[PDB]
Structures are given as C-alpha cells and as structure tokens.
C-alpha cells in the first residue's frame, strides 16, 4: 500500500522553485562578476592614486627621452 502522492500542480511547484533558482543563480553570477572584476578596478585605481606621483613618473618616462617635448 502507498499513500497519496502529488496529483495537481507538479509543473507548477517545479516552475516556482526553479524560477526562484533562476533569481538566485542570476544574483550569484552577478556577484561572481563583481567579486571577479568590479572592486579590483576601484581598489587598483585607489592604490595607484595614493602610490602615484605624476612628476616622478614623467621623470622616468623622460630619462628615456621618448617625448616630442623632451630633448
């Protein structure tokens, strides 16, 4: 003997749980894109702009003398 299994709305419950799965995997890959590339750009620009000196940087590009304004 077996009890009553689901007769009604099988595809219905399947579709609501899997559209919920669609939202969670969409936010998951959005977070994957963020954690992969997004805040690395901000933190790289940030550390570049504290550790950056334009005068010094021009100085080592101009020791090579590869400028039309530098001779």
């Amino acid at each position: 003997l077996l009890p009553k299994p689901q007769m009604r709305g099988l595809l219905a419950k399947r579709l609501r749980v899997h559209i919920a799965g669609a939202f969670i995997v969409a936010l998951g890959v959005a977070a994957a894109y963020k954690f992969g590339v997004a805040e690395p750009r901000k933190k790289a620009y940030a550390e570049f702009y504290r550790n950056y000196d334009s005068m010094k940087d021009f100085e080592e590009m101009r020791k090579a003398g590869i400028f039309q304004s530098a001779k």
């Binding site: 559209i19 669609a22 969409a26 890959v29 997004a38 334009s54 005068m55 021009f58 304004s69």
Partner: protein, 227 residues
C-alpha cells in the same frame, strides 16, 4: 593604444572615464544578470517533460513583468542621467585648442596667444622608425598639460570626421561649419592614442591622433623653443 588579447576597455586617463567604467561595470552586471536568467529558464523548460496546453490565464503577471523592468531600467538610467549631466560643468578652461579636420589628415592650433597651427599626418610603414606603432604614430604629436581642464573645439573643413581618443575616453564629430566642445582632463603624463571615427575617403584608416601629456612648464618650454 591597445594590448593584444584585450577583452575589456582602455584604462582611464580622465576621472569621468573612471566612473564611466564603474557605471559600465554596473551595466555588465545587468547584462549577465539578464542573460543568466534567460539561459537558466530556457534550460529548465528544455529539460522538462510535463505538458500544459490549456488556455493560459494572462492578467496575473503583467504588473510584476512591467514594474521589474521599470525599476531596473530607471536604476540604469539615473547613473546615465547623472554622468550626462556632469559632462558639462562650469569649465575652468586654463588652456584652449582648436582642431580642424582636413581631407585625409588633421590640423591643430593653439590660438590663446602667439598664434600657432600645424598639420598632423600618418607616418608611413616604411618611414616608421623602429620600435614605433603602425596606424597610430603621427609625425607631430599634440601636447597637453596634466591635471587640468583644457577645452577642445572640434570642426572639419571638407569631410566630416570624428576625433576619437578612447584612452582619454571621448569621441567628437568634426563637422564642416560646426565646432563642438570637449573638456579634456588627464591624470598621467605620457602618450595616448586615438583615430578618426567617421568615414572620410580613401585614407580614412590613416588619420590617427596622439596626445602626449606634459606639465605646463614643459608646455611653455616647447612653445617658446619651437620658434
């Protein structure tokens, strides 16, 4: 000025380019959000085996199906509105420069004082000095100081062009009889590259643009010493 196997964009020269790629990363987050949504729903409904071919009821989802695009499109658009509204602050134009696009080349003039104009062309491949860049090197570079807003007055004389500097991150259409304004700011000294971005004839590929960023001191040194 691009590197091989480039998948993203140029690194910034301008702060507006900085938050513009931040906004661009936001839009990329949106596009993989929607793409993963549609991919997983397609995969779900191709992997199913249940049939429901009755009369589908309709007036139950259109409100969510129109407010979620409403909110997502407006929260993409309001960064776009903000960035477009801050393209045009009250300028502090320390330096002015006019660019006059000629048939198959460019002209650049500094005309604030001691009127100066010159023509910039395409360095031929056989005339390329070793180590330089094909399709980007120009025999007369255009100099600008760093860390300053400089005004760009763009026009053309015979055929419309587009002065494009993706490294600075801008592209202005040069039109005969019409000059447009572009405010340029830079954070790093050195070379930055671009090209024409309108069709302009049988040497359309061969008008590139080079901007080298120097200080105002070396700028006035060049201006005095070129005579």
């Amino acid at each position: 000025m691009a590197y091989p196997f480039q998948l993203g964009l140029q690194d910034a020269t301008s702060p507006i380019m900085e938050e513009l790629m931040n906004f661009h990363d936001h839009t990329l987050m949106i596009v993989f959000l929607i793409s993963s949504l549609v991919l997983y729903i397609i995969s779900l409904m191709l992997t199913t085996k249940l049939t429901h071919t009755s009369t589908m009821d309709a007036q139950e989802v259109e409100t969510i199906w129109t407010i979620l695009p409403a909110v997502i499109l407006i929260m993409i658009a309001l960064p776009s509105l903000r960035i477009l509204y801050m393209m045009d602050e009250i300028n502090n134009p320390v330096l002015t420069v006019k660019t006059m696009g000629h048939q198959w080349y460019w002209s650049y003039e500094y005309t604030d004082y001691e009127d100066l104009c010159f023509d910039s062309y395409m360095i031929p491949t056989n005339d390329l000095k070793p180590g330089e860049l094909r399709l980007l090197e120009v025999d007369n570079r255009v100099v600008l100081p760093m860390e300053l807003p400089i005004r760009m007055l763009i026009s053309s004389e015979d055929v419309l062009h587009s002065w494009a500097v993706p490294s600075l991150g801008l592209k202005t259409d040069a039109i005969p009889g019409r000059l447009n304004q572009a405010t340029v700011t830079s954070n790093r000294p050195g070379l930055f590259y671009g090209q024409c971005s309108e069709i302009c004839g049988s040497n359309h590929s061969f008008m590139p643009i080079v901007l080298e960023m120097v200080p105002l001191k070396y700028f006035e040194n060049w201006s005095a010493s070129m005579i």
